[PDB]
């Protein structure tokens, strides 16, 4: 069998954007196995060892003035540049969520009824899902499975609401997402 | 509010290498090291942008050279295997005879080498399946997705079978219509 020891090296250039291209930070990092050893943080301006392993590298790289000037300028030439190139099909990408409401198949607890608000196939990930009972928001009883990133530029999530239904009540699942100007709503008529 | 990542890695002794761009966690593209071409995650991206694959090939060579030096410098300290967390879900609420897709989430693992297979009633499925390359994580472990298009039925029982050095035995994640 194959029992040879493995040795991994990762190099990551993270461009962090705040308010579009208003505030940008470049974080260059090297990871040996699962240990980040050295990095260049544009907020710092030079390489810094994260662990003893990376000391030789931060020292050598910081002695290279040309490398340093280019890395410092990269926030512009690389980060803001790539943001401008991809912004149209990434930052501005929008896929409206498919929203449906139905009762869970679990329903433990007799004179009770847990509702399920399924929100799927959307993009971007930022989304707000709230439950309401007769026009007023539900604070307690609400439970979410969390935001699920599908890996195909699509997200899904389930937000449940425990209820003690009374004929005539209207339970609404409201979804606010960048894909729509006004909130999406689906009502459960009890 | 946004993060774009150019992520790279080289793994010995497997000779595995990867170069990819990430946007808020979703892959923009990766470079096919053998064909030496850009592989866009979504077809349309290739119509809105371009990339010089040669840049990835140059970097990967530096990454390996660096790995070799670092491996020696660490007195050949090997990576500690971290088994993946495996989950199987549909991309949309399942309903009988309505086309859907099973997603196998392989997460929080390292090193970036795994064997993933789909099972339909104990037998391996190949038709229409697809997968992603290894995606980066903040803790420096990896994520990966495998997909299986299918037609729901109350009879079939699926399994996402995952093998990884961190697992003592193959992990079979069961999935069956329960709606």
């Amino acid at each position: 069998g194959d029992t040879r020891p493995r040795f991994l090296w990762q190099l990551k250039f993270e461009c962090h954007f705040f308010n579009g291209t208003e505030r940008v930070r470049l974080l260059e990092r090297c990871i040996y196995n699962q240990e980040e050893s050295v990095r260049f943080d544009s907020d710092v301006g030079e390489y810094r060892a994260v662990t003893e392993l990376g000391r030789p590298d931060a020292e050598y790289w910081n002695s290279q003035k040309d490398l340093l000037e280019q890395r410092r300028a990269a926030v512009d030439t690389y980060c803001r540049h790539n943001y401008g190139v991809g912004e149209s099909f990434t930052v501005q990408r929008r896929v409206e969520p498919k929203v449906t409401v139905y009762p869970s198949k679990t329903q433990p607890l007799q004179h009770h009824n847990l509702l399920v608000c399924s929100v799927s196939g959307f993009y971007p990930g930022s989304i707000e899902v709230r439950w309401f009972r007769n026009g007023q928001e539900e604070k307690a009883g609400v439970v979410s499975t969390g935001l699920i990133q599908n890996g195909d530029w699509t997200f899904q999530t389930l937000v449940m609401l425990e209820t003690v239904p009374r004929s005539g009540e209207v339970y609404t699942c409201q979804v606010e997402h960048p894909s729509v100007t006004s909130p999406l709503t689906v009502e459960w008529r009890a | 509010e946004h993060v774009i990542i150019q992520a790279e890695f080289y793994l010995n002794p497997d000779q595995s290498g990867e170069f990819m761009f990430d946007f808020d966690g979703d892959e923009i593209f990766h470079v096919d090291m053998a064909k030496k071409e850009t592989v866009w995650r979504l077809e349309e991206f290739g119509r809105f942008a371009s990339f010089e694959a040669q840049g990835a090939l140059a970097n990967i060579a530096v990454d390996k050279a660096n790995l070799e030096i670092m491996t020696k410098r660490s007195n050949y300290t090997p990576i500690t295997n971290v088994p993946p967390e495996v989950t199987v879900l549909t991309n949309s609420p399942v309903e009988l005879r309505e086309p859907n897709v099973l997603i196998c989430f392989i997460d929080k693992f390292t090193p970036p080498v795994v064997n993933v297979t789909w099972l339909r009633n104990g037998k391996p499925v190949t038709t229409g399946v697809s997968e992603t390359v290894f995606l980066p994580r903040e803790d420096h472990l990896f994520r990966k997705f495998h997909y299986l298009p299918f037609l729901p039925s109350t009879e079939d029982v699926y399994d996402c079978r995952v093998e990884h050095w961190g697992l003592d035995e193959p992990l079979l994640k069961h999935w069956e219509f329960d709606a």
Binding site: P56, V85 | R47, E52, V62, I69
Partner: peptide, 15 residues
């Protein structure tokens, strides 16, 4: 489309 740019990998100090 518009070209996505690459940042080049820095070589670690030699043995």
């Amino acid at each position: 489309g518009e070209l996505i740019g690459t940042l080049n990998a820095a070589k670690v100090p030699a043995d």
